[PDB]
Amino acid sequence: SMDIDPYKEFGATVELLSFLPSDFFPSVRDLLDTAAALYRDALESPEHCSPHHTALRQAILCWGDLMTLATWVGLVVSYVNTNVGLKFRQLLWFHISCLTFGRETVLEYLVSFGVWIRTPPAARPPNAPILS
């Protein structure tokens, strides 16, 4: 079979996004609403716009199919939100953040927050790293 990495063409890796803890990412619901709020006209556009746009379109739609399936099945519903949910919380956040703040900024922040959150509370700085 093949082994394809969705973040590879965007300069990152699966393991790199797994560096960030599970509770770091917003809910799938909050992510879909943000994609729409900031890029509704662009995501529905006839233009490619950018590779980030192309991937995000598939991501939103793919999660749609996944929800349509689990809704039809009705732990099973909980399965999508627990295991599959985490995967899209990463993917959706990655592209939205890259479109909003820029690829390079997102990547630096990723390693910066991973090191920061892993530092015990007593020693780590009060202000977490930010995008800009």
Is the CB of residue 55 less than 8 Å from the CB of residue 95?
yes
Distance in Å, CB of 79 to a second copy, minimum = 7
3-state DSSP assignment of residue 11: coil
**Cβ-based burial of 10 (10 A; exposed 0-12, middle 13-18, buried ≥19):** middle
Residue 49 or 117 having the CB closest to a second copy: 49
Q: What letter represents residue 78's amino acid?
A: S
Between 79 and 119, CB nearer to ligand VXJ: 119
Binder of ligand VXJ out of 28, 31, 56, 110 (CB under 6 A): 31
Fill in the per-residue mask, 32 to 71: x = in contact with ligand VXJ (CB under 6 A), - = not in contact. Answer: --x-------------------------------------
8 A C-beta contact, residue 49 and residue 95: no
Amino acid, res. 25: F
Rounded (5°) CA angle 104-111-88: 80
| Residues at the site binding a second copy, with contacts judged by CB under 8 A | 1-6, 8-9, 11, 32, 35-36, 40, 43-49, 51, 53-55, 57-62, 65-66, 68-69, 72-73, 75-76, 79-80, 84, 87
User: Contact residues for ligand VXJ (CB under 6 A)?
Assistant: 26, 30-31, 34, 93, 96-97, 130-131
